Amino acid sequence: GSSGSSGMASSVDEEALHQLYLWVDNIPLSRPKRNLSRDFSDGVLVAEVIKFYFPKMVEMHNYVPANSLQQKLSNWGHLNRKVLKRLNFSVPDDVMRKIAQCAPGVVELVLIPLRQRLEERQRRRKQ
Numbered sequence: 001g002s003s004g005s006s007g008m009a010s011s012v013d014e015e016a017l018h019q020l021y022l023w024v025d026n027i028p029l030s031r032p033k034r035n036l037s038r039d040f041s042d043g044v045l046v047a048e049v050i051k052f053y054f055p056k057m058v059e060m061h062n063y064v065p066a067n068s069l070q071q072k073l074s075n076w077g078h079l080n081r082k083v084l085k086r087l088n089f090s091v092p093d094d095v096m097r098k099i100a101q102c103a104p105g106v107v108e109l110v111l112i113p114l115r116q117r118l119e120e121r122q123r124r125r126k127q
Contacts, residue, residue, distance in 0.1 A: 012112075020112055027052055040111065041102035042066075043075045047083065053118045057086065072100040087117045 009016075024036055029048055031039065039045045044065045051058045063075050076096050084090065091110065098106040 016112070017108065020108065023115065037104055037107070038102055040107050041072070041100060043072060043079055047079065050083065050118065053122065069100055073097070076100055087121070089117055
């Protein structure tokens with residue numbers, strides 16, 4: 001069909017999730033076959049999504065993929081003052097802790113708005 005929706009949804013429905021789950025797949029990301037909620041948690045995956053829109057912004061030189069919470073959080077923390085910051089995006093530690101802990105819905109609550117922001121930069125007439 002087509003992108004159609006009657007009335008403005010004040011809250012987020014269960015459908016919204018799916019739409020966000022598909023959007024990711026659509027984008028050509030250098031990643032194998034595996035859940036998106038289990039990967040994103042890592043963090044290094046988020047920096048990739050941006051690369052598509054803004055490759056320059058991303059560096060992918062400091063961040064390192066690991067399998068330990070310690071590193072996980074350590075990585076996110078920076079991405080908050082290295083990436084988010086640029087996107088005038090801010091988030092408390094309490095929220096992050098959950099993200100790194102591969103928490104369902106938590107990290108997603110940031111993915112929805114995350115994309116909305118990126119676009120905000122596209123339109124912006126940056127010189």
